Amino acid sequence: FEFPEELKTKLQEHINYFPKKRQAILLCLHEIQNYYGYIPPESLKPLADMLELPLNHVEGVVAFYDMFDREDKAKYRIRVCVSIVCHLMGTNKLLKALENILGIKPGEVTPDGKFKIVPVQCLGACSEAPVFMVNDDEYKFESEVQLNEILSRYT
Amino acid sequence: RSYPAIPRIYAETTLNMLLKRAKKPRVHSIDEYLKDGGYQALEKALNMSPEEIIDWVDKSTLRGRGGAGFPTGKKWKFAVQNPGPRYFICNADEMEPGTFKDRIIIERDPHLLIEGIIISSYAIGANEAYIYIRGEYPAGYYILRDAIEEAKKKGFLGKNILGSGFDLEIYVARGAGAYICGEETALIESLEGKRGHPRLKPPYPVQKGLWGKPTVVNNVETIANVPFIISMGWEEYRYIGPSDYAGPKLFPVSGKVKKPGVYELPMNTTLREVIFKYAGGTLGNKKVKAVFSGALDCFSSEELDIPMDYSPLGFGGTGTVIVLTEEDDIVEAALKIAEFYEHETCGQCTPCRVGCYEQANLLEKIYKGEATEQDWEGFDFVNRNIQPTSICGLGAVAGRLIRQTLEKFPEEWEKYRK
Ligand SMILES: NC(=O)C1=CN([C@@H]2O[C@H](COP(=O)(O)OP(=O)(O)OC[C@H]3O[C@@H](n4cnc5c(N)ncnc54)[C@H](O)[C@@H]3O)[C@@H](O)[C@H]2O)C=CC1
Ligand SMILES: Cc1cc2nc3c(=O)[nH]c(=O)nc-3n(C[C@H](O)[C@H](O)[C@H](O)COP(=O)(O)O)c2cc1C
Ligand code: SF4
Ligand code: FES
Ligand code: NA
Ligand code: NA
């Protein structure tokens, strides 16, 4: 297994950014998940080499941090807040609208591999509850019609 | 450039300090910041001794806005009695439920935070500073990286800053989904490229932190105060709010209010005033049942006349105000809090690892009416026994809010017991 040059170059930028290479581990894993739509298990041995870390260290780190997904490839992660304030103000309405539009529930991927619904804890936008992200983009859910418009922008 | 979409959180200020620019929901770049006299406090600070700056921050009564309210000057004094090198860390992990105060500084007025970091780093003799921002704030990350390049361009970062002989680089690190990485020792473990496992304290970071060196960890909102303290002087800063708990405070208000958002107010403001005077009262003008101080405390409608300060009888915490009204089920809300701690314990300590899991798993059975008498007695026991042997605040408080709902809303819990 080998990192495509355009990804490897970004990884090296992160590794060169902090005073110590190993500090770059989370930025590299974010970058790998960004490129592939998940963390390929085969990616972890080469990353460990570049960070000059043992593989078991890198595997342990991937396991620890909930944003990293080794299981499901998805072009777009729909992160849905299931914490206290979004629950009070209508997480269940958001999930119902997501199911009506995409045919999937939390933890599931659409058949085309386009969308995965990821239930997450408080996204720190509680005044705008109920909150969701589509990759790096963050939104208040208003209604199914409004959610359908937002989702149409991700192709 | 273009940044990821951010919801436009409402922001309102009576003091026009932290939110002078951040009350407008957009990125304020270095020119706008400079136009408002930005980075003049840094120029003033670099013509003072580090010791003088610590003394001003001490005399200001500035307390940790991260939620514990530890005196900021006194933290810095502990750091500088230990030999260097020293590190300065800005904690931008902000992952407490209901808590969105720090992000509006980061995303709208990043230079206020950066100016604060440079002054604080100089005060403690740190030539290397870090921002650790949660992974779920990607826009905050890109905005801070761009803002840091702007500061470098204008000679506020790099070597020999404005001929002072003071060197500083600021590195932006990202979290990857762990609440525990906001705990200052877990944060430092994450900066070192490891899992977010809190360390036994003492030692505190000011004695042994990043690479074992003296390290100050301060919250975004704490650091954002430092430019005002230097600009105004500690004396004028102490004119803001009560002289014992002085300065502006950000109050992120959410749930059943008409105007959810962040409020910049003095800390003599009462909880009742936050909800009814500033946040426009309750949705449907329904009676307040409870206020969740993030996932830390639950105040009843009998506790609304408390100051929003770090006093023993005060609200304290992050200043986070989640409002529940008369029709909100307290046990349903307690379940969401249990689910949070279940998802976030790092598992190093046994009572925390099993207690956070069992508290959630049993409270779900109670909520769904599937609990045995043993499950009920079990739930009570585990709630009182998450804390023992815990080496950080998560284990210490994972049962705290839920215990307060059991004491303050017994009639509601008893309904479920049948
Ligand atoms: N903003 C957010 O999103 C979140 C905030 N929190 C807050 O975290 C708080 C608990 O934080 P902790 O760090 O566990 O509290 P703490 O009270 O143990 O420590 C507070 C600060 O003072 C320092 N300190 C305390 N005693 C010291 C001593 N003897 N010598 C030197 N320095 C000393 C610590 O190093 C730390 O920086 C809670 O009150 C909660 O509000 C928790 C989770 C998320
Ligand atoms: C589980 C846990 C999570 C924490 N998360 C944060 C956080 O996201 N941001 C923060 O500033 N402090 C957080 N804290 C508090 C820090 O450990 C520390 O007290 C604070 O960052 C010091 O800065 P301050 O004195 O300016 O408040 C957390 C504490 C615990 C126990
Ligand atoms: S108290 Fe809980 S979160 Fe804190 S170190 Fe122990 S197991 Fe981890
Ligand atoms: S509870 Fe959903 S964003 Fe905070
Ligand atoms: Na601008
Ligand atoms: Na914002």
Author numbering:
A (entry chain A): 6 to 160
B (entry chain B): 2 to 419
What does the publication say?
Complex I couples the transfer of two electrons from NADH to ubiquinone (Q) with the translocation of four protons across the membrane. The L-shaped complex is structured into a peripheral arm that protrudes into the aqueous milieu and catalyzes electron transfer with one FMN and 8–10 iron–sulfur ([Fe–S]) clusters, and a membrane arm embedded in the lipid bilayer that mediates proton translocation. Here, we show that the redox state of N1a regulates NADH oxidation in complex I by inducing a conformational change close to the NADH-binding site.
To ensure that the methionine residue at the homologous position in the E. coli complex does not change the local structure, we generated, purified, and crystallized the A. aeolicus S96MF variant. The mutation did not impose any substantial structural changes, although the hydroxyl group of the original S96 is no longer available for hydrogen bonding to the peptide carbonyl of D94. In addition, the larger side chain of the methionine residue displaces two water molecules, while another water molecule shows up in a different position. Still, the flip of the peptide bond upon reduction of the S96MF variant is clearly detectable. Accordingly, statements on the A. aeolicus enzyme can be extrapolated to the one from E. coli.
